[PDB]
């Protein structure tokens, strides 16, 4: 009864603390002796070199699961995709903890990727809830020309159509254009006054500047913005009244990995008595056969549900993504993020803090605006 766990982390202190967490999880009652083994590796700067090294070290060490987090440089993309494909060749379940990008959601590409961090697309599920409390019916969407943006748009459209409702319009823009003034100008000639933005940080800053120069930040407008489009340089150009989303302890890698190691240990314990067990391939070289128990391990991981983690309950969606995540709805006051509302799933609960709106208005505006200029 020997099961090894691979780790692809950023800093050595995290490696030591997660090794300590694995040592704690070794006994945890029930388990016997040395059923768990801990292995770790750093983030190799080159993607091809990283993909080679993860197979040369982790796969060669008989890892049942691989733990991978965000790179130590958040500004750089540095996606863990190279480590997802290789372990996906042998159906090895990789576990992401801080990769919020909505590319791994489609499991046709990443066959054995599971993440406990909700993606940006799930943020769309929050937005409809924001429409319920404030009675938003007419609304417009801005989406960057990216797979993540398209997935978020599809999720929002499906959730709105579930209530037999349609948004006013959706504007698609390429990730990097500067002359976005035409899109905002043509969006101004609409009844809806609330815009949902889904783009990159630079695109968010460009849209903020365009709105500022086109007097679109006045009273009446509502700006519902996600996590990626408020942080960083966006705060340089974000006007007051932004209703931004944030992930509670989403950037906290330590808590996410401490919950993930326990979830993986519980899944291994459940799997070691389910049915016939086939060992994972010893090495990447000289083995072109997929792991027979890989899909079963993935199903066990997706079916697992434990609230013992410090981040609250842990539940996986039908596609293997985080479900019922704690979101924080912040209202930008004096360019300062203030926690205004909480979202523990299903419903969103506000607090006693009053919500300000763009243009200095302290009263909730109305999305409907009868222009009376009927062409």
């Amino acid at each position, epitope marked *: 009864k020997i099961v090894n766990i691979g780790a692809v982390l950023s800093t050595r202190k995290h490696e030591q603390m997660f090794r*300590e*967490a694995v040592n704690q999880a*070794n*006994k945890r009652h029930g388990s016997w*002796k040395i059923q768990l083994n801990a292995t770790s590796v750093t983030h190799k700067p080159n993607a091809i070199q990283m993909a080679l090294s993860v197979c040369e070290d982790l796969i060669s060490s008989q890892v049942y699961a691989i733990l991978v987090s965000h790179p130590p440089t958040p500004n750089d993309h540095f996606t863990p995709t190279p480590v997802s494909y290789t372990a996906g060749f042998y159906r090895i379940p990789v576990l992401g903890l801080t990769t919020r990008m909505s590319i791994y959601s489609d499991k046709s590409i990443h066959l054995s990727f599971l993440r406990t961090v909700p993606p940006y697309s799930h943020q769309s599920s929050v937005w409809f809830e924001m429409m319920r409390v404030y009675s938003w019916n007419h609304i417009i969407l801005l989406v960057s020309d990216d797979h993540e943006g398209r997935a978020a748009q599809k999720r929002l459209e499906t959730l709105l159509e579930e209530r037999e409702s349609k948004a006013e319009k959706v504007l698609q823009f390429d990730p990097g254009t500067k002359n976005v003034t035409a899109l905002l100008m043509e969006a101004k000639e609409l009844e809806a006054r609330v815009i949902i933005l889904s783009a990159s940080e630079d695109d968010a800053a460009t849209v903020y500047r365009a709105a500022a120069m086109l007097n679109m930040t006045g009273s009446g407008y509502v700006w519902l913005v996600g996590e990626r489009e408020i942080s960083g340089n966006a705060l340089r150009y974000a006007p007051d009244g932004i209703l931004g989303l944030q992930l509670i302890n989403g950037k906290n890698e330590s808590a996410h990995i*401490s919950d993930a190691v326990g979830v993986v240990a519980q899944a291994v314990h459940e799997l070691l008595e389910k049915e016939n067990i086939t060992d994972p391939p010893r090495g990447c070289v000289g083995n072109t056969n997929i792991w027979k128990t890989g899909p079963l391990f993935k199903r066990v991981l997706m079916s697992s549900k434990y609230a013992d983690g*410090v981040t609250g309950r842990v539940e996986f969606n039908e596609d293997g993504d985080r479900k019922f995540a704690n979101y924080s709805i912040m209202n930008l006051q004096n360019r300062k993020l203030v926690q205004v509302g909480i979202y523990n799933g299903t419903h969103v609960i506000p607090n006693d803090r009053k919500i300000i709106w763009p243009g200095g208005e302290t009263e909730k505006p109305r999305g409907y605006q009868m222009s009376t200029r009927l062409k």
Partner: antibody
Amino acid sequence: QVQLVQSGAEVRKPGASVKVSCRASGYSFTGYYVHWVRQAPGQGLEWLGWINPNTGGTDYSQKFQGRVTMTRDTSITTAYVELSSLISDDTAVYYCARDATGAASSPFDYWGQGTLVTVSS
Amino acid sequence: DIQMTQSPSTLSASVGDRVTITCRASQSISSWLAWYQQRPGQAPKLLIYMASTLQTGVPSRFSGSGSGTEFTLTISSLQPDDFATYYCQHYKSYSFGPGTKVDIKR
């Protein structure tokens, strides 16, 4: 030298809640697991559970799951165990012990004096 | 869970008499057994770890041996401090044995 100071003996009525504190000194509190173990009079040792102050994770025995709670205070380096729904069988002597972090071969190197909890009418 | 059986349960011997304690587990536990000595009104004291190496500072009279499921503790000359209960515990299961104590013959 590892020093552990426990509270005095307590008498509680059945159905109430009891809290026992154990102050640790002379060693790195965060770098060692704190284990709670109870012993009935004239009976074998009954392992309650353990807690790691560094991470805050707690492990409880299956018998006491759902009623036992373990907390740690790093500011004063003190462990606390709270037990609810007390029964007559809970009358026992509780001990806090130290365990090395990352080592699974040195169980309970040091033992405390112990605190007696009596549940009777 | 691993069940520990100790023989004899209570040995009514005298001072200096050879004391042999045999502890058997339900299943194979390799060598993950710990021998502790406990006195009435006092906390147990560790004597042997890993079922083969005595704790540092323990008297040389104690001798621990065995493997698999069967382990043995031998005392050549029992002293006044040796009149105490002995427990064999499995670390991987945290299961303690019934306890072998030396009683005064009457």
